[PDB]
Amino acid sequence: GRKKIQISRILDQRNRQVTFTKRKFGLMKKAYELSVLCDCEIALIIFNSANRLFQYASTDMDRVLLKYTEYSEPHESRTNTDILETLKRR
Amino acid sequence: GRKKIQISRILDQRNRQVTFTKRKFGLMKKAYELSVLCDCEIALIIFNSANRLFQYASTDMDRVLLKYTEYSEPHESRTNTDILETLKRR
């Protein structure tokens, strides 16, 4: 971007809506890429303030979530709290 | 990247594993960003060939997936094709 921006709730509701749309797309774009590049399935679920649901699925959303439900073994599970720290490092 | 790469199953299993890890992180990073910037909840579910599960949640996968049980009407859903498609169209 033409200027560096910290990561914190964009205040101007106008700009916080222009950005949600722009990025949401890029996010899904990368998802899709990661999906094809490394041949893996991905489900992406987004919820905005107004609780409007947005989603993506490399192929089918119902399939991925199902497989997910019946998945009891362990696995990598991150959060923003986590991600924030992992970033405070490199 | 130091060179442009098409998007198709990375063949060299070595490189297709280095990339999965690198990107998967960046993806989650952006998710996290979109999450904080536009104050919205996001769940990210990844599955690799070996069916190893990887996931992210802006706060807790619990909340979102549960919160996805109520408002199940996706104001926007996308498949790998929409994206692929929307990629040229524009």
Binding site: D62, S72, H75, S77 | -
Partner: peptide, 23 residues
């Protein structure tokens, strides 16, 4: 760099009954 257990154990249960009936 924290890993962790499955995402949930109960919620996953509720999510499923839904997904299936959604048919």
């Amino acid at each position: 760099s924290p890993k962790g257990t499955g995402a949930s154990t109960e919620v996953k249960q509720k999510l499923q009954e839904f997904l299936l009936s959604k048919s």
